[PDB]
Design a protein around this motif. Structure first.
Motif, PDB file in Angstrom:
ATOM      1  N   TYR A 163      -6.337  15.160  -1.051  1.00  0.00           N
ATOM      2  CA  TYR A 163      -7.665  15.792  -1.322  1.00  0.00           C
ATOM      3  C   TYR A 163      -7.406  17.205  -0.704  1.00  0.00           C
ATOM      4  O   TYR A 163      -7.577  17.372   0.851  1.00  0.00           O
ATOM      5  CB  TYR A 163      -8.613  14.898  -0.802  1.00  0.00           C
ATOM      6  N   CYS A 223      -5.564  -3.634  -2.984  1.00  0.00           N
ATOM      7  CA  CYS A 223      -6.313  -2.978  -1.503  1.00  0.00           C
ATOM      8  C   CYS A 223      -5.845  -3.766  -0.827  1.00  0.00           C
ATOM      9  O   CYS A 223      -7.160  -4.754  -0.774  1.00  0.00           O
ATOM     10  CB  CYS A 223      -7.077  -2.051  -1.795  1.00  0.00           C
ATOM     11  N   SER A 224      -5.590  -3.634   0.393  1.00  0.00           N
ATOM     12  CA  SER A 224      -5.424  -3.915   1.334  1.00  0.00           C
ATOM     13  C   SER A 224      -6.354  -3.519   2.183  1.00  0.00           C
ATOM     14  O   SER A 224      -7.028  -2.944   2.351  1.00  0.00           O
ATOM     15  CB  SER A 224      -4.318  -4.403   2.329  1.00  0.00           C
ATOM     16  N   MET A 277       0.787  -1.272   0.000  1.00  0.00           N
ATOM     17  CA  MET A 277      -0.123   0.446   0.592  1.00  0.00           C
ATOM     18  C   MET A 277       0.681   1.091  -0.080  1.00  0.00           C
ATOM     19  O   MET A 277       0.541   2.294  -0.491  1.00  0.00           O
ATOM     20  CB  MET A 277      -1.085   0.027   0.977  1.00  0.00           C
ATOM     21  N   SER A 293      -6.460  -0.849   5.790  1.00  0.00           N
ATOM     22  CA  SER A 293      -6.191   0.618   4.575  1.00  0.00           C
ATOM     23  C   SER A 293      -7.693   1.450   5.415  1.00  0.00           C
ATOM     24  O   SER A 293      -7.873   2.305   4.792  1.00  0.00           O
ATOM     25  CB  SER A 293      -6.640   0.508   3.592  1.00  0.00           C
ATOM     26  N   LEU A 338      -5.755   7.268  -3.713  1.00  0.00           N
ATOM     27  CA  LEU A 338      -5.575   6.062  -4.137  1.00  0.00           C
ATOM     28  C   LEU A 338      -5.649   5.541  -5.732  1.00  0.00           C
ATOM     29  O   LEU A 338      -6.768   6.014  -6.220  1.00  0.00           O
ATOM     30  CB  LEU A 338      -6.195   5.213  -3.202  1.00  0.00           C
TER      31      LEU A 338
END
Lengths: 173, 117, 48, 48, 144, 219
Positions: free
Chosen positions: B50, F186-187, B43, F190, F197
């Motif tokens: 944002y 996607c883990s 990840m 998260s 992302l």
């Protein structure tokens, strides 16, 4: 080949037809087919090489099939029986029981002038056939050496036929 | 809503291009914190944010910068150096809006083929 | 039980069964000369 | 259950007619077998 | 051999969980089920005693070996079985002995955990792993 | 761990098919509205034609076991997958669940059902069992990222098989087996949100009111 065919019919086909006997009810649109079927099965009852179990299966299938058919679809078969039952040979138990069941279950169809509900009233030809069958069996039985089994089988058939025929059936012949 | 990719076409500059012609050379842009001159198997760590972060969009191959053409409804082009107010902020759209947009694309394609078997 | 019955139904349709049951057999016939012509039962379709 | 699972895992246990791809069906297989039987060249071994 | 014992423990734990799932729907456990449960509990108690013997002393190498193995999955599954069966065997008066055996097996498992905690400094790694494992099965721990 | 699959993890199911001596890779895909049948999005020539991974994304919701699954059916956290478990896959876009549809459209096969999406997870049709593709992996072991899986429908007992015929590739539930690589995208761990992302749909604002748009959607 004949023995193999008989084993196939009496172990696979005929029991299957016997179990599916209720589905024969309400098949007025296939009468001819049904008629043919009955004939063949009847013609299998009078077999030569059949064993006891096979003949029993054939007769049981015939009785179960005929039990669920309406009176209009049995007439042809009954006509053949009119030539066979009066003889009172070895193959008479099944025809006698079939006649007994038919004329004892469908007596309103023959006796009451109104008829048996949706099954309707009979016709002159059917009543004539019933009377001829009764007279043939009665006269033939009157000239037989006393056999307890034959008399025991024949008596209910005659009682059912008499209790189906209207008492005042004037036959114009 | 269109299914086309932002690209640097040779004939027209910055333009929407079909999914069939969209190779990496034409359609590949990057966000850069400023105009100052790998495959992490996970990840990663959050870098762009944002609303907070101001991003500069650069064409990976050409190196050009996404800038509005000088004169509101301003046009957009790729330029060698670009203005100083070329930073683009980002806002994530709601799930309903994105789903409706994709459904709009599919439905428009289907009915247009049906109103042109 | 339902799973196995469904698998069996998917394997062989009723059309195939009814067609197989409808295949005519070759049974022995009585020749005009008075001799019985019995087809071989080891190389023919049989009721078995 | 065990036999059906084992057979379905390996469709060739059903023979060529019941294989998924190219299978002609049980009725087609039986009719082909009868055609083979009627023709001595396709079933009996060679004369030599 | 430590890992081999842990592997057999996992296999036995999975079989025991399958048996519990089998008897979860039913009201009471018949004689054959109790017999097989008792035998499985005896084997599990022996395996727990073997692991406790391996790690006690303490043996740092064996402790680290067990901490990095799949022992915690077996602990979670056994907590599930204990929690859901000691509140199911206690409702029937003909399952006292099975309940006693289950409680003894729980005691053996807890002794093994205490052995894993030997020589454990404040904020140690094995303590953190055990807290994580107990948090993962917090429902069953609360039921116990 | 970075090599173990857990629930609530968005993954793509990829399969390799050898066509014309070239190993073309495909990803199982479906669409929500209009067409509920699954197809295979080609992700092999991705340098020249972009792949649409929006509809190839599934979510591993649950990872029960066979006896637990049976008990759950009869009754009416981030777990790790183990070989031999029954998993539930939810489409990330439409929210529908991958299902073994009884209806079939495969002329070549006879006992091959369809694979599609259905709104609700009711029944045993939407649960798939995981099996190792090699003897090195055995039942009960944790499923690892990059391992080739075998997916077997719980209800029909059919593999999630990929069919190749004359250059046409399809996916259906059939008694032949195909090996699937579950690539995580996607883990599940998260929770943190607020950063850009991959795959996110965004608006690019210039200044405060201005944003990057086009004149019309009509083509």
């Amino acid at each position: 080949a004949a023995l193999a065919l008989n084993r196939y019919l009496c172990s696979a086909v005929l029991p299957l037809l016997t179990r599916c006997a209720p589905l024969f009810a309400g098949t007025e649109h296939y009468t001819s087919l049904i008629d043919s079927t009955l004939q063949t099965i009847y013609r299998l009852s009078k077999g030569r090489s059949l064993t006891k179990a096979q003949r029993d299966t054939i007769e049981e299938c015939l009785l179960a099939i005929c039990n669920h058919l309406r009176p209009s679809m049995l007439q042809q078969l009954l006509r053949r029986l009119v030539f066979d039952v009066p003889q009172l040979n070895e193959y008479c138990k099944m025809p006698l029981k079939l006649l007994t069941n038919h004329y004892e279950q469908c007596w309103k169809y023959y006796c009451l002038p109104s008829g048996w509900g949706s099954y309707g009233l009979a016709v002159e030809e059917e009543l004539h056939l019933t009377e001829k069958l009764f007279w043939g069996i009665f006269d033939s039985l009157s000239h037989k050496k006393y056999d307890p089994d034959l008399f025991r089988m024949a008596l209910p058939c005659l009682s059912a036929i008499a209790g189906a025929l209207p008492p005042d059936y004037l036959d114009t012949r | 809503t269109t299914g086309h990719y932002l690209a640097l076409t040779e004939d027209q500059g910055l333009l929407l291009q079909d999914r069939a012609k969209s190779d990496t050379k034409s359609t590949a842009f990057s966000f850069r914190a400023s105009k100052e001159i790998r495959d992490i198997e996970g990840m990663g760590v959050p870098e762009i944010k944002y609303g907070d972060s101001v991003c500069f969009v650069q064409h990976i191959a050409s190196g050009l910068w996404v800038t509005y053409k000088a004169q509101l409804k301003r046009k957009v082009i790729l330029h060698q150096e670009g203005h100083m107010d070329d930073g683009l902020t980002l806002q994530r759209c709601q799930r309903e809006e994105s789903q409706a947009a994709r459904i709009i694309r599919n439905t428009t394609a289907l009915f247009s083929q049906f109103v042109s078997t | 039980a339902i799973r196995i019955r469904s698998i069996l139904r998917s394997l062989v349709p009723t059309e195939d069964l009814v067609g197989i049951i409808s295949i005519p057999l070759k049974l022995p016939s009585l020749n005009k000369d008075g001799s019985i012509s019995e087809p071989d039962m080891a190389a023919n379709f049989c009721p078995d | 259950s065990v036999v059906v699972k084992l057979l379905i895992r390996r469709p060739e246990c059903f023979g060529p007619a019941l294989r998924g791809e190219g299978g002609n069906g049980l009725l087609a297989a039986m009719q082909g077998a009868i055609k083979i039987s009627e023709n001595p060249a396709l079933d009996l071994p060679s004369q030599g | 051999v430590i890992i081999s014992t842990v592997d057999y423990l996992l296999r036995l734990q999975e079989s025991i969980s399958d048996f519990y799932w089998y008897y979860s729907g039913k009201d009471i456990i018949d004689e054959s089920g109790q017999h097989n449960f008792s035998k499985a509990l005896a084997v599990t108690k022996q395996i727990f005693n073997s692991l406790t013997e391996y790690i006690q002393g303490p043996c740092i190498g064996n402790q680290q070996s067990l901490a990095h193995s799949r022992l915690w999955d077996a602990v979670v599954g056994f907590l599930h079985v204990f929690a859901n069966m000691q509140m199911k065997l206690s409702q029937d008066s003909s399952q006292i002995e099975l309940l006693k055996e289950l409680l003894d097996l729980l005691q053996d498992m807890v002794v093994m955990l205490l052995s894993l905690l030997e020589g454990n400094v404040v904020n140690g790694t094995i303590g953190k792993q055990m807290v994580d494992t107990l948090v993962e099965s917090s429902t069953n721990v609360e039921m116990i | 761990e970075i090599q173990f699959l857990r629930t609530e993890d968005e993954v793509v199911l990829q399969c390799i098919a050898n066509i014309h001596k070239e190993q073309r890779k495909f990803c199982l895909a479906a669409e929500g509205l209009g067409n509920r049948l699954c197809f295979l999005e080609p992700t092999s020539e991705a340098k020249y034609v972009p792949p649409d991974l929006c509809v190839c994304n599934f979510v591993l919701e649950q990872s029960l076991s066979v006896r637990a699954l049976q008990e759950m059916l009869a009754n009416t956290g981030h777990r790790t997958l183990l070989y031999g478990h029954a998993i539930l896959l939810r489409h990330s876009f439409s929210g529908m669940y991958l299902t073994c549809l009884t209806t079939s459209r495969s002329q070549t096969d006879k006992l091959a059902f369809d694979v599609g999406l259905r709104e609700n997870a009711t029944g045993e049709a939407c649960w798939w069992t995981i099996h190792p593709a090699s003897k090195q992996r055995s039942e009960g072991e944790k499923v690892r990222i990059g391992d080739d899986l075998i997916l077997v429908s719980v209800s029909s007992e059919r593999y999630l098989h990929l069919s190749v015929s004359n250059g046409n590739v399809q996916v259906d539930a059939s008694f032949m087996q195909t090996l699937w690589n579950v690539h995580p995208t996607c883990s599940g761990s998260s929770i943190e949100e607020g950063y850009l992302l991959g795959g996110h749909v965004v608006r690019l604002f210039h200044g405060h009111d201005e944003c990057l748009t086009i004149p019309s959607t009509d083509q």
